[PDB]
C-alpha cells in the first residue's frame, strides 16, 4: 500500500488523461505497417491475455509466451507492460484496469517493434503486489542501471522480533528500570514472510531502533521501529533460474542487463514483550 508523497512525480506522466500518450513511443516511416483503423495486434493479444496475466497464472502464461517467440517483440512488450502496470498499482490504482488502459494505448501504435511501449528508466516504484517481480525483472533489462524504490511497507514483512535470537540476545543484557538504547541490525530472509518479495530481495539487512523498559522483576516492553538497508538487484538471469525456469533463463541470458540499487525507505513500527 503506502499513500506516496503529494509530489511523487510518476515516471509515466499522464500527457492527456485516460491513457492516450502516456505509454508508447515515437513514429518512423510512416503511419503504415497495417491498415490504419485496426488496433495494433500486439495490443490485441495483451488484451486477450489479461485474465491470465493479471492473475496468479501470470508466470506460467508468460513463460509460455517467451518460449513461443524466444523473448521476442510480444514477450518484451508484455514485460514492459507488466512494469507500467505494477508501477500504477504502486501509485494506488487497480492493477487490471491500469493494465487494460496500457494495452489499449499500445493498441493505438502504428508500429510493430519492441519499443511500441516506453520504458522510462526514471523514478520507478515497486507495488509489492502480483507483478512486482516482473517489474523488477523488467527493470534489470530495460532500466539502464537506474536505481528504483521499493517502500518497506510494500515488501510484506511481518517481523517477530521474539524469534530472532541475536536481537533477543541483546534485549536480555544488563539493564536499568527505565531507558536503554537498542540499535541492532540483522540479516533477514524476506522469505520468512513473503516469497514474491523474496524473488526480488533475497536476504536484506534490517535494523531495529528503540528502547526497552523493565518493571517489578521482570518483563519489558520494547517499542521502536524497523528499517531496511538498501539492497542490490542482481540482474544476471542465472540468478533467477529458480523462478523463471530453464527456457526463459536461457533466452534472457542472450539479452543484456544492468544490476541496480533497490532503495527501501520507511518505518515499520514495532512493540513487543517478554520475561525472565
Characteristic terms for this protein:
276 residues, alpha+beta, DNA polymerase, domain 1, Beta-Lactamase, 2 domains, five-stranded antiparallel beta sheet, three-stranded mixed beta sheet, 33% helix
Describe, in short, the structure shown.
The chain has eight helices and eight strands. It has helices at residues 41-53, 58-69, 73-90, 95-107, 132-142, 165-171, 195-201, 241-251, and strands at residues 148-149, 181-189, 203-211, 214-215, 219-229, 231-233, 260-263, 268-274. Strands 2, 3, 4, 5 and 8 form a five-stranded antiparallel beta sheet that branches.
Q: What is the topological layout?
A:
Elements: H1 41-53, H2 58-69, H3 73-90, H4 95-107, H5 132-142, E1 148-149, H6 165-171, E2 181-189, H7 195-201, E3 203-211, E4 214-215, E5 219-229, E6 231-233, H8 241-251, E7 260-263, E8 268-274
Parallel strand pairs: 1-7
Antiparallel strand pairs: 2-3, 3-5, 4-5, 5-8, 6-7
Protein name: Bacteriocin, putative
Organism: Pseudomonas syringae pv. tomato (strain ATCC BAA-871 / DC3000)
Binding site for Mg(2+): 213
Amino acid at each position: 500500500p503506502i499513500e506516496l508523497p503529494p509530489t511523487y512525480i510518476t515516471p509515466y506522466p499522464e500527457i492527456s488523461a485516460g491513457g492516450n500518450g502516456t505509454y508508447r513511443g515515437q513514429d518512423l516511416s510512416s503511419g503504415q505497417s497495417f491498415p490504419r483503423g485496426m488496433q495494433n495486434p500486439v495490443a490485441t493479444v495483451l488484451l486477450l491475455q489479461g485474465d491470465l496475466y493479471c492473475s496468479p497464472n501470470c508466470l506460467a502464461t508468460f513463460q509460455d509466451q517467451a518460449r513461443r517467440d524466444s523473448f521476442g517483440i510480444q514477450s518484451k512488450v508484455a514485460l514492459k507492460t507488466f512494469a507500467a502496470a505494477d508501477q500504477r498499482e504502486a501509485e494506488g490504482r487497480d492493477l487490471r484496469t491500469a493494465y487494460n488502459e496500457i494495452a489499449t494505448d499500445i493498441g493505438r501504435s502504428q508500429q510493430i517493434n519492441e519499443n511500441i511501449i516506453k520504458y522510462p528508466p526514471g523514478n520507478h516504484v515497486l507495488s509489492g503486489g502480483l507483478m512486482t517481480p516482473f517489474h523488477a525483472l523488467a527493470h534489470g533489462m530495460f532500466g539502464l542501471g537506474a536505481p528504483l524504490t521499493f517502500p518497506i511497507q510494500n515488501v510484506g514483512l511481518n517481523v517477530d522480533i521474539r524469534g530472532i535470537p541475536d536481537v533477543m540476545n541483546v534485549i536480555q543484557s544488563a539493564r536499568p528500570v527505565g531507558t536503554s538504547s537498542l540499535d541492532v541490525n540483522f540479516a533477514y530472509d524476506v522469505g520468512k514472510d513473503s516469497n514474491a518479495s523474496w524473488l526480488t530481495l533475497g536476504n536484506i539487512t534490517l535494523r531495529l531502533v528503540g528502547t526497552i523498559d523493565k518493571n517489578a522483576s521482570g518483563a519489558w516492553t520494547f517499542s521502536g521501529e524497523i528499517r531496511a538497508f538498501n539492497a542490490v538487484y542482481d540482474a544476471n538471469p542465472s540468478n533467477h533460474r529458480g523462478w523463471l525456469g530453464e527456457n526463459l533463463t536461457s533466452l534472457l541470458s542472450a539479452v543484456p542487463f544492468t544490476s541496480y540499487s533497490i532503495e527501501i525507505p520507511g518505518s515499520l513500527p514495532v512493540t513487543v514483550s517478554g520475561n525472565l
